[PDB]
Amino acid sequence: EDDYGELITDEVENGINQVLDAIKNNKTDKLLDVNEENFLEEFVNQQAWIPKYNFRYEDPNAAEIISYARSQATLRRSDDSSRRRKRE
Amino acid sequence: SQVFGVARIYASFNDTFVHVTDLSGKETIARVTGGMKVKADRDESSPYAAMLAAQDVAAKCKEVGITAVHVKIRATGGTRTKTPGPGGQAALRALARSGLRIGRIEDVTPVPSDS
Amino acid sequence: VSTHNRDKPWDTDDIDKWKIEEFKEEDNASGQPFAEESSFMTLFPKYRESYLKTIWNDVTRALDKHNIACVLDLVEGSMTVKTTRKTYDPAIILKARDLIKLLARSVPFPQAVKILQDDMACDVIKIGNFVTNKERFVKRRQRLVGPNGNTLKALELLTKCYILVQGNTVSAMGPFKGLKEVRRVVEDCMKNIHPIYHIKELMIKRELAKRPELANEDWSRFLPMF
Amino acid sequence: PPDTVLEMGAFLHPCEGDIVCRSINTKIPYFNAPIYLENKTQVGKVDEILGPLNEVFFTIKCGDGVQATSFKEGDKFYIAADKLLPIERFLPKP
Amino acid sequence: EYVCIVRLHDALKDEKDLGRSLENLTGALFQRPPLISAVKRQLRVRTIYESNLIEFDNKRN
RNA sequence: GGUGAAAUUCUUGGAUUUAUUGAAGACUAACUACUGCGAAAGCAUUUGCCAAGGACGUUUUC
């Protein structure tokens, strides 16, 4: 289970950056052939994907996935399993 | 004084279908597609083409005399998404605008158990 | 290859097909309500229960704006939305079904209430059936969030959609194109294709969409294969 | 949450969104006392006490999120033991 | 001694249910005064000595 | 049909959609879950049959 951008290598990243620079240059031959942009550039350049109510990330603790108990006291009707009836 | 004919609507992300059919389902009154209203392939997902197709289907039903229509909305289903398309709501509201009564509204989107 | 396709001169390019008209009580020319009452029922997990206990009246108030009855029964553990006689909009019951599904899938109510708008649309993606192993499932679910939520924010910047990853479901609220893109990202992430692989492709697609000349041509030559 | 609960009532009628119960226990509950299920989960508050001395009934006003049609015959409803009063208190003094 | 007309919200399944309930509540009873009454609302035991169902109509309820 | 736009394919012989019948393989939608179970693999339709366990207590030809 690759989780550090295995297929997207450094050479592939450099090629994608060169293609992006060629697109930003708006060359005719290339065409024929705070700020969210700053945050995206910081995420891309510093490899933020690699590990070390408008939106979810605005709320605090958006990183943690909240886990819950498998048993709760509640008003919900619970049907007994056939195994428990057989034991009884 | 009330004529019931089920109007089955296909609300996909790519296009929309309207299909006026008898209550038994054996005999179909009329059919119309999003691509029939608009020549562009990208405009098949557009709400305006779905509204035009719904208006044409409602005119055909009024010619057939269908006073009220039961509606069954059915998404892409299966392994694909279950969200109804943009044009389904617009065509349902267009059928409301046409003056036909709206009967029972149920969802017939197919869901698999797994895989 | 649209073979045997007839022309459509009645279509106008000046008309905005993406525009959505509002609805009113006098919009329907029938003048009569729905013949049969239509209801939609969903279940919710037990851990949501108490939160629903504190929000439901407010939820009712929202449905009071759209003349839709609602009921929440804890013993069945179900929430049902029903159309009323004063209801005049046929799709608002579907939007209420979307609302109760989003509320069951742990989307908070200040965010979930916006599904009643015509523009918004929701998609709930099931991720429990992709991989059977628990550790691999947890790891691939953490790939979507990443460290400190950052790539998740990038996914928001990819789609302009509210994305919430809870348990076995990913809930996405936003425009239809963003819904399809995040569906692609979530399914490919559960099939162990990394989220940044699609994030970079979406960034390149946005840069290609910036130029109309590149938008006219195929993006597959410029974009890297994945 | 209550420390202990006692068998207060048995389900009889769901009328008008409130639970009618035969009083199994031999003492009279407080007005607006919380009614629980045996997992000590609050279902509603006592709304009305009625019926003759030999057969006492009480009506529970259900809390929000609880529906009266969800229950069935033979169900039991529980109350904290502090919320009870002797029957001879309401009887006339000698 | 009163003569009272009771209005039922829904029709009974059988007519003798009202008579059975009327003879059920004959005797000592637990009552709380309504909010309209000027006295304080407290649970008291009051005796209904006799009762008799003069008439009952399901259609008129 | 699908795409950002596309494109390959299917067909006025009926593509697509809807309704029914027959056959085949697969799965058990919501509740549902990194707090349950299992050594791992993995595991929720009903009904039975079979074998074995986990935690607790009493202990052991220990």
XYZ file of C-alpha atoms (C1' of nucleotides) in Angstrom:
646
model
C 0.000 0.000 0.000
C 1.914 3.009 -1.315
C 1.102 6.208 0.582
C 3.905 8.629 -0.366
C 3.158 9.253 -4.046
C 5.056 6.286 -5.470
C 3.876 6.570 -9.082
C 4.110 10.373 -9.011
C 7.903 10.452 -8.827
C 10.235 13.454 -8.657
C 10.910 13.252 -12.401
C 7.177 13.065 -13.154
C 6.590 16.012 -10.811
C 9.308 17.993 -12.609
C 7.730 17.166 -15.970
C 4.301 18.234 -14.710
C 5.829 21.468 -13.391
C 7.478 22.092 -16.775
C 4.145 21.487 -18.529
C 2.428 23.868 -16.096
C 5.103 26.510 -16.735
C 4.639 26.083 -20.493
C 0.868 26.463 -20.062
C 1.311 29.563 -17.885
C 3.672 31.040 -20.488
C 0.719 30.933 -22.959
C 2.994 30.086 -25.881
C 1.222 29.706 -29.220
C 3.413 26.743 -30.201
C 2.782 25.051 -26.847
C -0.968 25.648 -27.167
C -1.019 24.293 -30.729
C 0.986 21.192 -29.778
C -5.964 34.549 2.723
C -5.522 33.201 -0.812
C -6.436 29.629 -1.723
C -3.908 29.584 -4.584
C -1.077 30.295 -2.131
C -2.276 27.473 0.138
C -2.467 25.096 -2.838
C 1.042 26.099 -3.955
C 2.354 25.563 -0.417
C 0.681 22.143 -0.265
C 2.091 21.111 -3.652
C 5.625 22.433 -3.117
C 6.190 21.252 0.465
C 4.655 17.778 -0.173
C 1.835 18.299 2.323
C 0.153 15.064 1.225
C 3.159 13.093 2.493
C 2.902 12.557 6.274
C 5.597 13.765 8.648
C -19.864 26.214 8.335
C -18.746 26.862 4.760
C -16.386 23.863 4.683
C -15.134 21.041 6.886
C -11.563 22.301 7.316
C -12.791 25.632 8.698
C -14.237 23.789 11.692
C -11.714 22.682 14.349
C -10.586 19.049 14.680
C -11.431 18.262 11.050
C -8.335 16.052 10.821
C -9.444 13.547 13.459
C -12.000 10.900 12.493
C -14.424 10.572 15.388
C -14.877 7.018 16.664
C -17.922 5.875 18.617
C -18.698 2.959 20.907
C -20.396 -0.112 19.467
C -22.727 -0.270 22.488
C -24.914 2.648 23.595
C -27.806 2.852 26.027
C -30.747 3.962 23.914
C -34.484 3.763 23.279
C -33.953 1.672 20.132
C -35.498 -1.791 20.100
C -32.879 -4.536 19.824
C -33.893 -7.940 18.486
C -32.291 -10.867 20.294
C -30.068 -13.177 18.274
C -31.182 -16.747 17.608
C -28.135 -17.997 19.526
C -29.291 -16.300 22.743
C -32.780 -17.773 22.325
C -31.235 -21.213 21.777
C -29.159 -20.824 24.953
C -32.283 -19.816 26.897
C -62.694 13.041 -13.883
C -59.116 11.990 -13.095
C -56.892 10.064 -15.519
C -53.804 8.406 -14.031
C -50.739 7.680 -16.137
C -47.359 7.030 -14.532
C -44.636 9.429 -15.672
C -41.279 7.721 -15.138
C -38.344 10.141 -15.131
C -34.689 9.204 -15.636
C -32.494 11.781 -13.881
C -28.922 10.917 -14.868
C -25.812 13.084 -14.761
C -25.511 12.816 -18.545
C -29.094 13.208 -19.782
C -32.732 13.065 -18.686
C -35.634 10.932 -19.918
C -39.357 11.509 -19.464
C -41.645 8.554 -20.169
C -45.436 8.749 -19.856
C -46.863 5.233 -19.559
C -50.143 3.580 -18.578
C -50.700 2.421 -15.001
C -50.099 -1.229 -15.896
C -46.878 -0.278 -17.687
C -47.587 -2.469 -20.716
C -48.591 0.438 -22.978
C -46.368 3.525 -23.140
C -48.013 6.832 -24.022
C -44.964 8.921 -24.930
C -41.213 9.302 -24.480
C -38.757 12.190 -24.737
C -35.032 12.593 -24.104
C -32.719 15.442 -23.185
C -30.827 15.012 -26.443
C -34.072 15.496 -28.355
C -34.523 19.021 -26.982
C -30.925 20.207 -27.446
C -28.481 19.171 -30.156
C -25.408 19.636 -27.948
C -24.247 16.596 -25.989
C -23.269 18.723 -22.984
C -26.686 20.406 -23.038
C -28.389 17.061 -22.384
C -27.530 17.465 -18.695
C -28.841 21.032 -18.756
C -32.120 21.770 -16.908
C -33.563 23.725 -19.856
C -33.554 20.728 -22.212
C -35.180 18.607 -19.499
C -37.841 21.289 -18.994
C -38.517 21.426 -22.747
C -38.793 17.627 -22.904
C -41.140 17.655 -19.901
C -43.281 20.316 -21.593
C -43.451 18.202 -24.763
C -44.363 15.091 -22.749
C -47.033 17.052 -20.870
C -48.465 18.295 -24.174
C -48.547 14.694 -25.425
C -50.271 13.588 -22.205
C -52.830 16.397 -22.518
C -53.462 15.213 -26.076
C -53.920 11.718 -24.629
C -55.965 13.221 -21.789
C -53.738 12.285 -18.837
C -54.998 14.601 -16.097
C -52.638 13.410 -13.344
C -49.278 11.639 -13.436
C -47.625 9.363 -10.912
C -43.895 10.080 -10.858
C -41.054 7.574 -10.438
C -37.569 9.099 -10.326
C -34.739 6.662 -11.032
C -31.059 7.606 -10.898
C -28.015 5.974 -12.495
C -28.118 3.247 -9.839
C -26.103 0.056 -9.697
C -22.409 0.530 -9.013
C -22.750 4.145 -10.145
C -24.038 7.084 -8.123
C -27.512 7.297 -6.595
C -27.882 11.086 -6.773
C -30.579 12.226 -9.238
C -29.381 14.425 -12.073
C -29.786 18.199 -12.361
C -32.509 17.948 -14.994
C -34.809 15.630 -13.044
C -35.886 18.287 -10.557
C -36.312 20.831 -13.364
C -38.463 18.476 -15.440
C -40.553 17.566 -12.380
C -41.125 21.268 -11.722
C -41.943 21.735 -15.418
C -44.576 18.995 -15.152
C -45.898 20.923 -12.151
C -45.955 24.130 -14.237
C -47.842 22.381 -17.047
C -50.901 21.997 -14.809
C -51.024 18.214 -14.472
C -51.582 16.919 -10.954
C -48.709 15.095 -9.254
C -49.563 11.786 -7.613
C -47.444 9.546 -5.403
C -43.731 10.390 -5.434
C -41.470 7.392 -4.827
C -37.836 6.627 -5.632
C -37.119 3.530 -7.728
C -33.329 3.901 -7.873
C -31.811 0.384 -7.857
C -29.393 -0.276 -4.996
C -27.154 -3.372 -4.882
C -26.328 -5.304 -1.739
C -22.600 -5.339 -2.572
C -20.195 -5.152 -5.535
C -20.713 9.552 -33.650
C -24.316 10.715 -33.184
C -25.781 8.742 -36.071
C -29.286 9.602 -37.345
C -29.615 12.691 -35.135
C -32.004 15.447 -36.196
C -31.166 19.144 -35.972
C -32.443 21.426 -33.202
C -32.836 25.021 -34.469
C -35.192 25.957 -31.614
C -32.285 25.869 -29.155
C -30.744 29.290 -28.514
C -27.129 29.777 -27.460
C -27.981 33.121 -25.843
C -30.405 31.446 -23.429
C -28.695 30.327 -20.217
C -29.659 26.663 -19.926
C -27.914 26.427 -16.543
C -30.264 29.063 -15.090
C -32.792 27.751 -12.558
C -36.201 29.361 -12.113
C -37.810 29.789 -8.707
C -41.066 28.123 -7.667
C -44.223 29.569 -6.123
C -47.545 28.369 -4.747
C -49.351 29.604 -7.865
C -46.815 27.924 -10.164
C -48.900 24.761 -10.570
C -51.953 25.385 -12.745
C -53.808 22.374 -11.322
C -54.799 24.271 -8.185
C -55.080 20.996 -6.264
C -52.645 19.203 -3.927
C -51.080 15.777 -4.401
C -53.535 12.892 -4.644
C -51.567 10.480 -2.433
C -49.288 11.272 0.494
C -45.669 10.379 -0.289
C -43.202 9.620 2.507
C -39.484 8.841 2.682
C -37.971 6.963 5.633
C -34.313 6.569 6.619
C -32.472 5.109 9.589
C -29.655 6.788 11.501
C -26.850 5.412 13.687
C -27.312 5.421 17.448
C -24.456 7.858 18.126
C -26.266 10.516 16.083
C -29.369 10.090 18.288
C -28.799 12.647 21.053
C -27.614 15.273 18.562
C -30.818 14.774 16.580
C -32.617 15.092 19.933
C -31.220 18.616 20.203
C -31.754 19.733 16.605
C -35.040 18.249 15.352
C -37.342 21.169 16.218
C -35.039 23.495 14.271
C -35.158 20.950 11.435
C -38.955 21.063 11.650
C -38.769 24.857 11.410
C -36.790 24.515 8.185
C -39.373 22.092 6.836
C -42.029 24.491 8.122
C -40.630 26.891 5.530
C -41.382 24.359 2.799
C -44.665 22.873 4.129
C -43.225 19.368 4.647
C -44.119 17.295 7.697
C -41.363 15.425 9.533
C -41.233 12.790 12.273
C -38.352 11.285 14.270
C -39.066 8.031 16.115
C -36.253 6.761 18.328
C -37.706 3.296 18.935
C -37.511 2.338 15.259
C -34.569 4.725 15.058
C -36.054 6.302 11.941
C -36.678 9.731 10.464
C -39.510 10.160 7.961
C -40.381 13.154 5.776
C -43.930 13.395 4.434
C -45.547 15.697 1.924
C -48.532 17.718 3.120
C -51.712 19.091 1.602
C -50.276 22.614 1.715
C -47.177 21.378 -0.132
C -46.974 22.727 -3.686
C -43.419 21.804 -4.760
C -43.002 18.210 -6.013
C -39.199 18.025 -5.633
C -39.019 19.396 -2.079
C -39.857 15.943 -0.707
C -36.810 14.587 -2.560
C -34.689 17.402 -1.133
C -36.051 16.545 2.328
C -35.079 12.902 1.768
C -31.599 14.150 0.886
C -31.678 16.291 4.048
C -32.503 13.392 6.371
C -29.915 11.178 4.655
C -27.259 13.871 5.160
C -28.330 14.360 8.783
C -28.028 10.615 9.376
C -24.581 10.613 7.760
C -23.194 13.040 10.390
C -23.361 16.249 8.349
C -24.077 19.143 10.766
C -27.403 20.943 10.399
C -26.051 24.488 9.566
C -24.341 22.839 6.600
C -27.028 20.222 5.911
C -29.913 22.720 5.739
C -28.557 24.182 2.487
C -29.626 21.064 0.543
C -33.129 22.594 0.474
C -31.758 25.170 -1.965
C -32.233 24.231 -5.609
C -28.563 24.764 -6.530
C -27.091 22.363 -3.961
C -26.898 18.599 -4.482
C -25.548 15.800 -2.298
C -23.842 12.461 -2.910
C -23.259 9.783 -0.271
C -20.493 7.374 -1.290
C -20.250 3.989 0.429
C -16.657 2.942 1.131
C -17.139 -0.074 3.405
C -17.356 -2.629 0.602
C -14.167 -1.750 -1.305
C -11.654 -3.541 0.949
C -12.370 -6.197 3.575
C -9.276 -5.773 5.759
C -9.730 -3.333 8.633
C -6.213 -1.853 8.679
C -6.163 -1.220 4.923
C -9.622 0.371 5.134
C -8.512 2.678 7.963
C -5.328 3.612 6.084
C -7.153 4.389 2.828
C -9.747 6.411 4.742
C -6.909 8.394 6.321
C -5.481 9.031 2.838
C -8.550 11.167 2.066
C -8.106 13.286 5.195
C -4.306 13.165 5.206
C -2.246 15.052 7.778
C -4.073 18.011 9.495
C -6.969 17.856 6.995
C -4.832 19.630 4.402
C -5.422 17.498 1.302
C -9.098 17.334 2.306
C -9.096 21.129 2.073
C -7.378 20.673 -1.292
C -10.241 18.372 -2.261
C -12.571 21.211 -1.285
C -10.406 23.475 -3.438
C -10.730 20.799 -6.116
C -14.519 20.819 -6.064
C -15.935 23.705 -3.946
C -17.976 21.065 -2.094
C -18.399 20.266 1.583
C -16.809 16.840 2.113
C -17.310 14.842 5.312
C -15.731 11.414 5.829
C -17.522 9.443 8.555
C -17.437 5.699 9.138
C -18.318 3.909 5.919
C -19.664 6.985 4.087
C -18.280 10.083 2.385
C -20.890 12.853 2.168
C -20.377 15.539 -0.485
C -22.546 18.664 -0.814
C -22.009 20.928 -3.808
C -22.268 21.388 -7.585
C -22.771 18.335 -9.792
C -19.349 18.473 -11.471
C -17.666 18.637 -8.070
C -19.820 15.710 -6.942
C -18.650 13.619 -9.905
C -15.011 14.613 -9.332
C -15.123 13.737 -5.627
C -16.884 10.465 -6.493
C -13.950 9.644 -8.777
C -11.439 10.628 -6.083
C -13.143 8.638 -3.307
C -13.606 5.467 -5.378
C -10.035 5.600 -6.698
C -8.735 6.244 -3.176
C -10.575 3.193 -1.870
C -9.013 1.339 -4.805
C -5.555 2.433 -3.474
C -4.886 5.110 -6.096
C -3.554 7.990 -4.015
C -5.660 11.182 -3.642
C -2.773 13.448 -4.700
C -2.668 11.604 -8.052
C -6.155 12.941 -8.817
C -5.516 16.268 -7.052
C -2.620 17.100 -9.385
C -4.711 15.977 -12.367
C -7.568 18.241 -11.247
C -5.151 21.161 -10.860
C -3.808 20.531 -14.376
C -7.394 20.289 -15.647
C -8.229 23.650 -14.050
C -5.123 25.215 -15.615
C -6.145 23.791 -18.998
C -9.674 25.136 -18.480
C -8.167 28.574 -17.843
C -7.007 28.712 -21.483
C -9.862 28.491 -24.033
C -7.479 27.168 -26.701
C -6.446 24.307 -24.414
C -10.105 23.785 -23.481
C -10.934 23.327 -27.170
C -8.356 20.544 -27.526
C -7.933 17.293 -25.612
C -6.319 17.626 -22.187
C -5.023 14.041 -22.225
C -1.905 14.921 -24.228
C -0.926 17.747 -21.868
C -1.959 16.042 -18.627
C 0.176 13.153 -17.313
C -1.250 9.649 -17.482
C -2.726 8.136 -14.324
C -29.679 9.321 35.645
C -31.667 7.581 38.396
C -29.896 5.144 40.693
C -32.843 2.716 40.838
C -36.092 2.358 38.897
C -39.383 0.654 39.737
C -42.144 -0.826 37.576
C -44.551 2.085 37.207
C -46.894 1.348 34.334
C -48.073 -0.965 31.584
C -48.959 0.251 28.085
C -52.703 0.527 27.431
C -53.509 3.210 24.821
C -51.412 5.538 22.622
C -54.179 8.155 22.413
C -53.362 11.722 21.228
C -49.601 11.242 21.239
C -49.538 10.413 24.955
C -49.066 7.038 26.609
C -51.883 5.674 28.771
C -50.648 3.204 31.397
C -52.185 0.950 33.985
C -50.370 1.672 37.249
C -48.762 -1.618 38.268
C -47.123 -0.022 41.303
C -49.204 0.760 44.388
C -48.016 4.353 44.940
C -48.848 7.607 43.167
C -46.151 9.308 41.046
C -45.209 12.970 41.157
C -46.627 15.248 38.499
C -44.114 15.834 35.669
C -41.912 13.051 37.045
C -39.559 11.529 34.443
C -40.592 8.099 33.166
C -37.795 5.746 32.115
C -37.265 2.446 30.402
C -35.341 -0.276 32.233
C -32.049 0.759 30.644
C -32.842 3.993 32.544
C -33.670 5.923 29.375
C -36.132 8.799 29.666
C -39.199 8.354 27.470
C -41.387 11.137 28.865
C -42.930 12.933 31.813
C -46.067 12.129 33.819
C -48.891 14.293 32.491
C -52.082 13.101 34.177
C -53.210 10.781 36.987
C -56.725 9.379 36.678
C -58.888 6.347 37.336
C -60.525 4.947 40.460
C -58.721 3.936 43.630
C -58.799 0.220 42.790
C -57.530 0.780 39.229
C -55.243 3.804 38.870
C -54.186 4.927 35.393
C -51.680 7.563 34.373
C -50.930 9.416 31.154
C -47.312 10.120 30.193
C -46.535 13.081 27.963
C -43.910 11.736 25.581
C -40.658 13.604 25.119
C -39.639 14.942 21.742
C -38.386 12.293 19.359
C -40.649 9.646 20.937
C -43.841 8.518 19.196
C -46.775 6.842 20.929
C -47.452 4.381 18.097
C -43.998 2.814 18.483
C -44.940 0.946 21.657
C -46.915 -2.283 21.951
C -49.141 -3.932 24.536
C -47.405 -5.391 27.570
C -44.545 -2.883 27.568
C -43.366 -1.623 30.949
C -42.492 1.934 31.971
C -40.245 2.714 34.937
C -39.870 5.625 37.362
C -37.300 6.644 39.957
C -38.356 5.630 43.458
C -38.004 9.175 44.811
C -40.877 10.347 42.592
C -43.538 8.358 44.483
C -46.174 9.294 47.065
C -48.292 7.073 49.337
C -51.922 6.605 48.336
C -53.128 7.416 51.865
C -51.754 10.961 51.540
C -54.479 11.924 49.058
C -57.141 10.186 51.141
C -59.115 12.377 53.584
C -57.665 12.650 57.069
C -59.566 10.915 59.927
C -75.966 16.428 40.257
C -75.112 17.320 36.655
C -76.344 16.360 33.215
C -73.369 16.482 30.870
C -72.756 16.171 27.133
C -69.362 14.676 26.292
C -67.961 15.027 22.775
C -65.646 12.284 21.521
C -62.945 13.065 18.968
C -63.306 9.739 17.135
C -66.090 7.190 16.825
C -65.931 4.191 19.140
C -65.516 0.645 17.867
C -68.538 -0.428 19.950
C -71.204 1.587 21.750
C -70.972 -0.110 25.150
C -67.386 1.055 25.751
C -68.600 4.461 26.943
C -71.021 2.814 29.366
C -68.309 0.497 30.691
C -65.956 3.447 31.225
C -68.729 5.474 32.877
C -69.369 2.687 35.381
C -65.589 2.317 35.725
C -65.136 5.916 36.883
C -68.073 5.713 39.295
C -66.638 5.732 42.806
C -63.618 7.416 44.303
C -61.520 9.197 41.682
C -58.185 10.957 41.326
C -58.740 14.456 39.948
C -56.682 17.587 39.420
C -58.596 20.872 38.952
C -58.336 22.541 35.536
C -56.361 25.727 34.990
C -59.643 27.622 34.527
C -60.622 26.974 38.155
C -59.369 29.547 40.648
C -58.217 26.892 43.120
C -54.696 25.478 43.033
C -54.153 22.346 40.940
C -53.538 19.489 43.377
C -54.452 15.815 43.195
C -57.548 15.056 45.275
C -59.872 12.090 45.753
C -63.481 12.908 44.867
C -66.452 10.538 44.896
C -68.954 10.148 42.065
C -71.804 8.304 43.763
C -73.948 7.434 40.743
C -73.821 7.733 36.973
C -76.160 6.812 34.140
C -75.575 7.004 30.388
C -78.793 8.617 29.165
C -77.877 8.662 25.469
C -74.985 8.119 23.070
C -74.667 8.828 19.336
C -71.659 7.697 17.298
C -72.554 9.693 14.177
C -73.014 12.869 16.216
C -70.180 11.665 18.521
C -23.104 5.914 -24.109
C -19.340 8.809 -21.832
C -16.156 13.379 -21.397
C -13.780 19.339 -19.069
C -14.801 19.262 -24.373
C -14.385 14.814 -26.604
C -13.768 10.085 -28.761
C -14.626 4.097 -29.692
C -19.234 1.332 -30.029
C -25.207 0.162 -30.464
C -29.082 0.547 -33.702
C -35.882 3.062 -37.289
C -33.858 -4.403 -38.260
C -36.118 -0.624 -32.468
C -30.461 1.610 -30.016
C -32.107 3.577 -25.060
C -36.381 3.398 -21.537
C -40.603 0.694 -19.367
C -43.451 -4.080 -18.133
C -43.353 -9.703 -17.979
C -41.234 -14.652 -18.364
C -37.000 -18.216 -18.219
C -31.798 -19.427 -17.086
C -26.809 -18.415 -14.928
C -23.229 -16.455 -11.517
C -22.804 -13.009 -7.337
C -24.370 -10.453 -2.835
C -27.103 -9.573 1.913
C -28.977 -2.129 0.610
C -29.956 1.247 5.679
C -29.084 -0.105 11.088
C -22.954 -0.210 10.548
C -19.217 0.296 13.577
C -10.097 1.763 13.828
C -14.377 0.213 21.449
C -17.865 -6.968 19.071
C -15.692 -11.622 17.684
C -11.057 -14.322 15.402
C -4.272 -16.467 16.027
C -4.497 -14.299 11.277
C -7.452 -14.412 6.899
C -11.822 -12.186 7.821
C -16.961 -11.943 9.661
C -24.720 -9.247 10.065
C -31.256 -12.765 5.304
C -34.613 -16.687 7.842
C -34.513 -21.612 9.664
C -32.280 -25.858 11.820
C -27.590 -29.342 12.678
C -22.479 -29.958 14.195
C -17.873 -28.775 16.672
C -14.976 -25.064 19.411
C -14.222 -20.846 22.125
C -13.615 -15.321 24.629
C -14.187 -12.427 29.445
C -15.852 -13.781 35.050
C -16.073 -16.916 39.412
C -14.758 -21.785 42.015
C -10.543 -24.227 41.533
C -6.833 -27.697 39.831
C -3.361 -35.500 40.592
C -1.348 -29.116 38.085
